[PDB]
Amino acid sequence: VAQGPNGRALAESMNPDLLSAIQQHISIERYASVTFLAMSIWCAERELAGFYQFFDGEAKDEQSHAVHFTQYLIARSQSNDLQTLDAPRQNWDSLASLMATAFQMEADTTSSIQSVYALAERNSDTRTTVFLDPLIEAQIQSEDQFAYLLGRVKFANGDPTALLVIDNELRAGQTQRG
Amino acid sequence: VAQGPNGRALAESMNPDLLSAIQQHISIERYASVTFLAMSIWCAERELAGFYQFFDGEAKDEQSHAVHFTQYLIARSQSNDLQTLDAPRQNWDSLASLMATAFQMEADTTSSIQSVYALAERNSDTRTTVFLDPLIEAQIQSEDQFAYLLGRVKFANGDPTALLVIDNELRAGQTQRG
Amino acid sequence: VAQGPNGRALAESMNPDLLSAIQQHISIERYASVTFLAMSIWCAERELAGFYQFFDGEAKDEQSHAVHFTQYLIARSQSNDLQTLDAPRQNWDSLASLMATAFQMEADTTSSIQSVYALAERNSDTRTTVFLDPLIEAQIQSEDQFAYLLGRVKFANGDPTALLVIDNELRAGQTQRG
Amino acid sequence: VAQGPNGRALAESMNPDLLSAIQQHISIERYASVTFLAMSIWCAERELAGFYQFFDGEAKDEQSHAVHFTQYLIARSQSNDLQTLDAPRQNWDSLASLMATAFQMEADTTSSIQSVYALAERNSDTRTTVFLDPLIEAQIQSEDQFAYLLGRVKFANGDPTALLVIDNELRAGQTQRG
């Protein structure tokens, strides 16, 4: 039995470029997490308590997604490499602009997984494509969700009354098309 | 065993300036209570039933805070001195202006406790600083709460529809960032 | 009513050095969190599943502690400044060495809070000393806890059998002196 | 409606090489099952009752995995071909050596599924790649599990006391990183 780079028994060697790409994706999701935290703070500073609670939960969830990747690397007997985390964006001119960044960030997270996916297919790493399949499904649902929240905020067209109504929807946990 | 000024057994003498400062603070909180009552009336006169219920509860709570101080003076075997209570402010041009007074009044209540706190530290009265510690913590939460309510009302920008929505939030007990 | 730097109503201005020190402390605890994650990975790579579960929970808890500080800055109407997060340490020669880093890191977190505490006392910021008091109490319990875990691992003296027994204690949630 | 080789109605013809590869994989998993039985016996002969119970359950589970493949062939209207089953390995010099064979056998089972997977992609048999996807996911978890058990046994370094502790973990059903 061979030994993997993290020292555990090795079921199948992983190409170094694919390992590097997975390690980079972990940073992307860790960065999405701290960005959701910054968005949570921005909303709380403006008394948008429903959006604050929603993004506080999103930050914790996105961190879980990142940790789920570190578990996979352990499972493949590969080394993790937790990287420097950049400072998140912290300033937006409007809630609509913040939601736009939130939506683009979810699409960018999906693009990153797709890039890992294509590299795994090139290497015929079927463990990794199988591992990624449900994560892509969750990204589809997240994209649908943030398009919903962005579109609903844009529909409000900056009217505070409408934004207060949407804020209360989020506090109630009404965060998706039903 | 020595006898305190209120006649009970005395654990530790209190400096007269600190007693006077505590007695004055009791008036501050009794005055904040009657001010909350006046604010409750103002809101009820304008059919803002949620704000009326919220301030009615605040008046009772602030009175409890005042009585909690009289209990401490008893506990220290010091005399209470219940003072003349001024008439509260009763007229505001807008809900936003009323909430501003409410917020400033909570900050002023905290400043008063801080003044008592600093005088107790000068006198090395550790019973009083310990007694005040949780009251300062509650003041932090009250300041955060009234900044939330003030900011949310200001966000409404005088639109009656938005103010009706916030009024219903308060009637439901949704009075804080979640 | 004055406006704080984060735009909310301001109860009491905060000295810029104290704000900066609080913002730095938030980074310390965010860094302790990612370090606990790295320690969790190290343990899982060596099949120390109890230590892995323990440190996975510690990482989430330490992140909660950091977020609790960001909430206080919001409560004081101060701006948050989420900083670049360095890469954590990821390599140790033994579990005993890892636990030593874990213990020193908790003591260093306490030293950081103490530094903020002393700066708040200099500025007579009683809101901040009151806010920090229970966090120091929790740090005392964490230090006692990690001294227990470190000492128990050191008592094992590198014997795998003893380390397996301690690993199972942690998986059961037996993480403290009773 | 056309008739498949097993006589049922045929939704889509299967390439004979892919059928042959699936039939061979069924033998691989049937052989892994009887190997787990032999490992169960080896452990029981040495009073490692926890490992005996664990491998007894593994043998039954691996047989279920094999039968799940025969069901798929029925579902595709293809003929099953239950093959001669070789005698399993039955002698090991140590528990660590037995666990090494167990881990390598799980990795080899995954390699076999991967080989079927790649042949199905060449034939554009999307029913078969979809059918195999969750089986690869379960193989990832099994590989992670047996790397855990192998590494934990190796950590014991042949000390009987440590092996007795691990034996009791398995009897309790503690067979994975938590």
TrEMBL record, chains A, B, C, D:
Fe(3+) 2 binds at residues 62, 106. Keywords: Metal-binding. Transmembrane segments: none annotated. Fe(3+) 3 binds at residue 133. Fe(3+) 1 binds at residues 29, 62, 65. This is Ferritin. It comes from Synechococcus sp. (strain CC9311). The lineage of its organism: Bacteria, Bacillati, Cyanobacteriota, Cyanophyceae, Synechococcales.
